[PDB]
Amino acid sequence: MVQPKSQKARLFITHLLLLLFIAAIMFPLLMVVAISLRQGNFVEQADGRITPPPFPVLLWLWNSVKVAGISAIGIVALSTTCAYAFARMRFPGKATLLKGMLIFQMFPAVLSLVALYALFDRLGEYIPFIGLNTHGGVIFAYLGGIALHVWTIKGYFETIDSSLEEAAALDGATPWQAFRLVLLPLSVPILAVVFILSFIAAITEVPVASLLLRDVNSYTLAVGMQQYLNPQNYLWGDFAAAAVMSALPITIVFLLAQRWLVNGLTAGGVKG
Amino acid sequence: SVLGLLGLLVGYLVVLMYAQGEYLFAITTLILSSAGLYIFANRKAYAWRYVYPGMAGMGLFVLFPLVCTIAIAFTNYSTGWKNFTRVFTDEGIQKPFLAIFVWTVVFSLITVFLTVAVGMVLACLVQWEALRGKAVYRVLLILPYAVPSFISILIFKGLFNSDPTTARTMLIIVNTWLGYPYMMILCMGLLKAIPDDLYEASAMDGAGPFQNFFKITLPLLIKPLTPLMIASFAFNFNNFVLIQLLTNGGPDRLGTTTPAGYTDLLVNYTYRIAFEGGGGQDFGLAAAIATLIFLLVGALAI
Amino acid sequence: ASVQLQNVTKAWGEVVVSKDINLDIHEGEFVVFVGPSGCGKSTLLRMIAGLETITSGDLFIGEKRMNDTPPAERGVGMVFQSYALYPHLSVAENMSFGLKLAGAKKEVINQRVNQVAEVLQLAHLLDRKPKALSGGQRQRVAIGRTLVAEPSVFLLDEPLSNLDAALRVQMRIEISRLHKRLGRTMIYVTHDQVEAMTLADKIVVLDAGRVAQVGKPLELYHYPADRFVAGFIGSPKMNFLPVKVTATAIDQVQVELPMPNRQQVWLPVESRDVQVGANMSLGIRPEHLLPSDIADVILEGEVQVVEQLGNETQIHIQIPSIRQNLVYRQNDVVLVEEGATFAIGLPPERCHLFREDGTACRRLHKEPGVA
Amino acid sequence: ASVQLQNVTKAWGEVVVSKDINLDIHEGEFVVFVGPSGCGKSTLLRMIAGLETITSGDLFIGEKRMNDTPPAERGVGMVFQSYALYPHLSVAENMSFGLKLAGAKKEVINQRVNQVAEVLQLAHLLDRKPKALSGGQRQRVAIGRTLVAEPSVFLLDEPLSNLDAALRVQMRIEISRLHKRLGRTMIYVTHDQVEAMTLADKIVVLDAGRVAQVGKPLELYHYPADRFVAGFIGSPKMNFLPVKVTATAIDQVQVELPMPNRQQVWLPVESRDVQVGANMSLGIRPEHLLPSDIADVILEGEVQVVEQLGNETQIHIQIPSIRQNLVYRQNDVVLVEEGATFAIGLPPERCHLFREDGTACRRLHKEPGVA
């Protein structure tokens, strides 16, 4: 039997340890106590009464989820293409580009805010990636410049055996057809993982607040909670309600991508 | 011919760039347009055809803003080398600067080690088929990314109500709690790709769970995680205006003047001769110290 | 370890790949499993090792039930068909993994690894990742890993598939030496008749997930107990002829060949249950067919295919009124061209008689080398 | 498409896995590659297909340089050593992948896939992923992919390594029929002498990335060029007795046997480039050793190991003089126990002679078969 003896012991120890870890890392995330101090906060973000900032469920949550989904889809596509190229074909300057892109990946916002604000207010002319408050030009599909995911799909591509796409190429498939019909279906868990990471990064993105010109109506829920955080009152009992609301889309996206994740994809493929 | 008409519409814009007097913008847009058009039109550069969109997006997202900042470092914005001579002769904080950088690098190393270890262990545990509540367990485990990392500190401060060593320990533990799910998702993805036949052989060799992990799971995951570990090390080395509520005031571990703000990692140690341009809109000096930190961390990385 | 199996039945849902296997391997016995591709050999090896569950029946190893014992504590070692090689370790690390895990010593492990690499002719490739290797070298690395380990049971699974003839011979000699040194029970799965007939004290011939016969190699070659086993044992499959029984004696059955002259011969086979008029199935091995210079029925035919092997010539004759072609193995090089006439003699004493259901009438001829 | 390589040399860093290869394959030729385990057969195959890059030389396919041509356009279909199959596709999808990529019709795809699967015995497996397929079935799917394709060049890389005797015979027959029907170039790599001699129009033997000899199968068997090919073609390997020269006639050499009686025999071998007193290496094939009843010179010794193969008996004799064992092959079953004395005769007309370098003086004996 593959199942080992004394499994109940290891299973029980693992369950107890995981439960204790869950409690320890959930206690600081018990943010709902400040909300449920008064039930009027859920004031009344979900429905009813009047709240000076607009009802997050229909506006801020929707904007955040739309931006996150679009950015994640574009990021996944671009990163998977770049990683396939880098990992499994040759072109001059490849190594130099990898080392460069790694170095230029890392940067703080102390330069980002001024440089990107200059970029946006210099853009000015008419293109769909409108620099100023757009909700469709900034952030939206414009978070696309990513290095971690390019590296991640590349490294995953290095794991998969090459002989599969070698046989595909020997069958007359162009590299595009091979990449579409062999490499991606066996590499789909990494696309799921990177999609998850991109969605969470886009959802919880407080910096790059280029939507400040139009700061009441539709814009990102992160900047919305930042507006909730006001110096002269430090009002939090309703501010954290938007955070607990934004806890939901990540859970839903994680479950949807969980339906994708699977092991043993390259099972029984090649010998040796 | 369709890819040729698209260039003209882009090419019509390049006139407006020169019309508005922004020669650098005109140069960048003409360069990118010519590169894309030629790469697509010529059939020989298939790999460059695959590479161009991502590289161009990366350029316009990071590289141009970064080089603009380095250029700002060489002008007053209120110069060439006077700001760099100043930051070199910055003796008033030079001795604290070295020690602050040392503590920052030690802190980043220990926190990236702890984060990777915790994430990998949890991903391997959830990978187990004998575990029953896999889905609920892993969703509750990823949950710590729900907070946008701006008031998790506030609730921590509310639940905790001195001892700069304790401040450092709280710093490290809050980074681990806030960053482990990233490495856990990464290790889940990378654990999906391990062939099971190696585990079969290792079991044939008498390997238990711990030995099996340390011998097959760890070495096959540490290899694709190395670039990710380096990047996460850089991210845990430098920070910005976000997740800033730990250590309200100045802990003064190494004579550091730290605000009501977290991540003292060579940013809050210098906020006032820095931040919004040295506190008095000296963005030239701010960009100069930013260029210095970029240069030395790049030296460390290689 | 006296590996024993009783009513071991496997099932992948509804299909059954192992049906009532009752094996019995004594301590320190060499047993070889041979069967048609997909009979269940690898599944049976895994079930013995524990890589796959046993649905019903009892598996005994060393007089201890091992149905639910984990594969690590089973105390067995297996050579995988995919070689189960670690990609992230050199050849030395791959072969020394087991001894390093089981209480390493830093000198005896090194000595054992160097000796095994030397006797596998793997010295110069001691520090190369399995990517930088050939198929034969990978298979030999798996063999060396198993040999460096000292398992109670050696579960070798086709370890000589990607090797030239001289290397196969040397590997067989080395495995025989290791067996005669250790005295450990070993189970060997192979598709080579030379390997099976050489390295065996007992052979098991699987067929669609069931045991067809068990015995000595000479017993299997000389007195096959089933039509399938008789067709399986031997590299050129034995020529089978449909035939009608005409009369039965006390200890010999006479039969009537389907050729036009319908000559009848007396076969010294068991007469029990043999019914006059049954549609039998005569079988004669290609090597046993004598040239036509012997007074006999003489199956004259016409040549179709001549295969030259250097040391022997294989002639396929299309006998009239015969669906298949009799295969004839003459010694040395014979210059016979296609479309020519050829005749062969049928030894009465070398013929196996098979009934309609596939069973065999037991032969009554005392062949040499079989007790 | 004809395949010809001109001074092709591939070097992995320092290691020269292929050195100055000069092969020429005409249209419709069944060239079979044999050699030691790791001499460079698979590397040559991959470099012909284009998966590897040659460090020198030129590779012509259809009289056009293909050093820089990608694998798609070369028109080479290869059956891998590792059964390179797509695990996310069932058997039918795996086989029809190439046709679907070619954009053929569904009806043609289905008809041809069924046709191939019928002869490869996979009809009931036609709806399964490779994870549930045994090793032999995986190999058969690997072969069937190229079979249902129609590439101008067939690169079969050890295709029948994990198949039983009868199934391997059937696969040989089907592949030979396929080649006869089509008339396309097929390069075959095998470790089966039966396969090589029964399928090859021309055999190529490699040795450490170097071509040893190229010619007909029986030509290789009868007149080997060097010691390596002489000991490699034919199993078991040929016996080798170091000898000393005494007198060289016009067309025959007198070697002095190392026995204490110093019997000298005249070998009908080329007398060019041999000096009186040189130290040559005599070689006699095992199957050609004669019984001691009728012979001129007898090589008396004692039996060490006797292998009973059923259709034949192999006897190892320890001669007091030569250190090796004279491997002897006798037809049928002979009952000789170990430790008993045994004497065999040496037929002078059937022995090869070799120099210390390795080159063999050509035999003056007109062996039958070879022109």
Ligand SMILES: Nc1ncnc2c1ncn2[C@@H]1O[C@H](COP(=O)(O)OP(=O)(O)O)[C@@H](O)[C@H]1O
């Ligand atoms: N990547 C590699 N680097 C160095 N040597 C290699 C590499 N791959 C194979 N070799 C060696 O080079 C020779 C080529 O043989 P191989 O590629 O295994 O195929 P084959 O044995 O069928 O010719 C072998 O000795 C092999 O061990």
Ligand SMILES: Nc1ncnc2c1ncn2[C@@H]1O[C@H](COP(=O)(O)OP(=O)(O)O)[C@@H](O)[C@H]1O
């Ligand atoms: N998961 C599975 N489900 C159903 N049938 C299987 C499965 N795996 C293998 N088989 C089939 O069952 C038989 C078992 O053979 P296999 O497991 O391939 O090993 P071997 O051929 O070495 O005995 C084969 O016919 C194989 O195709």
Ligand code: VO4
């Ligand atoms: O791929 V091989 O080393 O068996 O010629």
Ligand code: VO4
């Ligand atoms: O179907 V196999 O006995 O070659 O694993």
Ligand SMILES: [Mg+2]
């Ligand atoms: Mg098998």
